[PDB]
């Protein structure tokens, strides 16, 4: 229906061409169910703020929590820290026998 039109607009905005529509539809339905879980979170933080309404603040802490949940990435500060750690280490010991490659 209209949701296929929305996805067609998406994949045009994605600029790339070839798919299956079942892939597209299962994208849609899992995405809507993620939206409904956001709505569940809205119910929760409306309940614990003891208000019948859902604020913008409710949306804010819901997306903060779920951005902590399923939106990972490695930090460039942690990248530079690991860089300093391991790139500080310049040991490279070389042995005569080398077929062995393990001590598990």
């Amino acid at each position: 229906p209209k949701d296929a039109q929305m996805m067609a607009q998406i994949l045009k905005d994605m600029g790339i061409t070839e798919y299956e529509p079942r892939v597209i539809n299962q994208m849609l339905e899992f995405a809507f169910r993620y939206v409904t879980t956001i709505l569940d979170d809205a119910k929760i933080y409306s309940s614990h703020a003891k208000k019948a309404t859902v604020d913008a603040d409710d949306v804010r802490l819901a997306i903060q929590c779920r951005a902590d949940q399923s939106f990972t990435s490695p930090p460039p500060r942690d990248f530079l820290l690991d860089i300093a750690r391991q790139r500080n280490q310049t040991p490279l010991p070389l042995i005569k026998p080398x077929x062995x490659x393990x001590x598990x």
């Binding site: 209209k2 929305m6 998406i10 798919y19 892939v23 994208m27 809507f32 809205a42 119910k43």
Partner: protein, 339 residues
């Protein structure tokens, strides 16, 4: 040169989905920014699954891909079209078309049907193939006939070599193989009926590709076989080839044609059967021809009529079809019971 506006779901529909859980009375901008946020995460993940399949190196995106995304001054003398190499390859093709060893035969058949890009050992090949057809129609030799007709079959299935421009010196050789007088010997007319069967089958394979255009195919071959069926005082090889070619054209073709020709050809049957004093060549010929075309025409009226009242259906089919028509209807009911 491009503008990527935000694909934003209509927030009233989002409130319908929301209050399907029965939440509250919702304001618009909340659901607007919700569609914004979810669209951000979706299109991010869309870029991510693109990074997946552009290292898995397919331009199609499966469910499984996104599942893995959810881990978050005298002129010079001429030169022919051939090479010497490929014309000797052509000579191998021809003498394998002669070929007695059926391994060499099938090798040739596969070599025809699966040399795409050949295209240039086209028409010259097919042209005095058709000329050899004419000369051996004169020579009246079934072996050259079956070799050339299976050769044309293998020509028909080599998918790249398009037939269109070179059609019009081939199809009449097929129909000359259809019509008449394939008479090596009078007790040996038996294989020629199967030759005509195979030929009309080839015509059926032809007709599904070319009559979109100018209607030489359908209109001319149908009116050919029409007035050929009208042709009285002709040998029954002509009648068999005509009616078999019309049979190969399809269900609705026969539904048109053998609707009057049911009882008219039944009149032809009982002109033949209980007919002459003695001509047993023509008797046995036309008799098995009428039998073949009877039970081959049978699935049309089997698909058309229900199989009730075989005594009335024989009256509906001039008697001689009964009960061979009824036996074929029993066979058709058995074939339906096989389903």
């Amino acid at each position: 040169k491009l503008k990527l506006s935000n694909t934003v779901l209509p927030s009233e529909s989002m409130k319908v989905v929301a209050e399907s859980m029965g939440i509250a009375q919702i304001q618009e901008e909340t659901c607007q920014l919700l569609t914004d946020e979810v669209s951000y995460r979706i299109k991010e993940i869309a870029q991510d699954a693109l990074k997946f399949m552009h290292m898995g190196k397919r331009q199609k995106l499966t469910t499984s891909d996104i599942d893995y995304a959810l881990k978050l001054x005298x002129x010079x003398x001429x030169x022919x079209x051939x090479s010497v190499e490929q014309q000797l390859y052509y000579k191998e093709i021809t003498e394998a078309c002669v070929g007695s060893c059926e391994a060499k035969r099938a090798e040739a058949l596969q070599s025809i049907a699966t040399d795409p890009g050949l295209y240039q050992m086209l028409p010259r090949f097919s042209t005095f193939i058709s000329e050899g057809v004419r000369v051996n129609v004169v020579q009246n030799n079934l072996a050259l006939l079956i070799y050339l007709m299976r050769m044309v079959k293998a020509l028909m299935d080599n998918p790249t070599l398009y037939l269109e421009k070179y059609v019009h010196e081939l199809i009449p050789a097929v129909m000359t193989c259809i019509v008449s007088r394939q008479l090596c010997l009078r007790p040996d007319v038996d294989n020629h009926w199967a030759l005509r069967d195979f030929a009309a089958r080839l015509v059926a394979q032809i007709c599904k590709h070319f009559s979109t255009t100018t209607n030489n195919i359908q209109s001319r071959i149908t009116k050919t076989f029409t007035k050929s069926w009208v042709d009285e005082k002709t040998p029954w090889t002509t009648r068999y080839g005509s009616i078999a070619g019309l049979a190969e054209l399809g269900h609705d073709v026969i539904k048109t044609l053998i609707l009057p020709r049911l009882q008219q050809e039944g009149e032809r049957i009982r002109s033949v059967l209980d007919g002459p004093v003695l001509s047993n060549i023509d008797r046995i010929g036309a008799d098995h021809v009428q039998s073949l075309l009877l039970k081959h025409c049978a699935p049309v009226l089997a698909k058309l009529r229900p199989p009730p009242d075989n005594q009335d259906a024989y009256r509906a089919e001039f008697g001689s079809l009964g009960p061979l028509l009824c036996s074929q209807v029993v066979k058709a009911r058995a074939q339906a019971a096989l389903q």
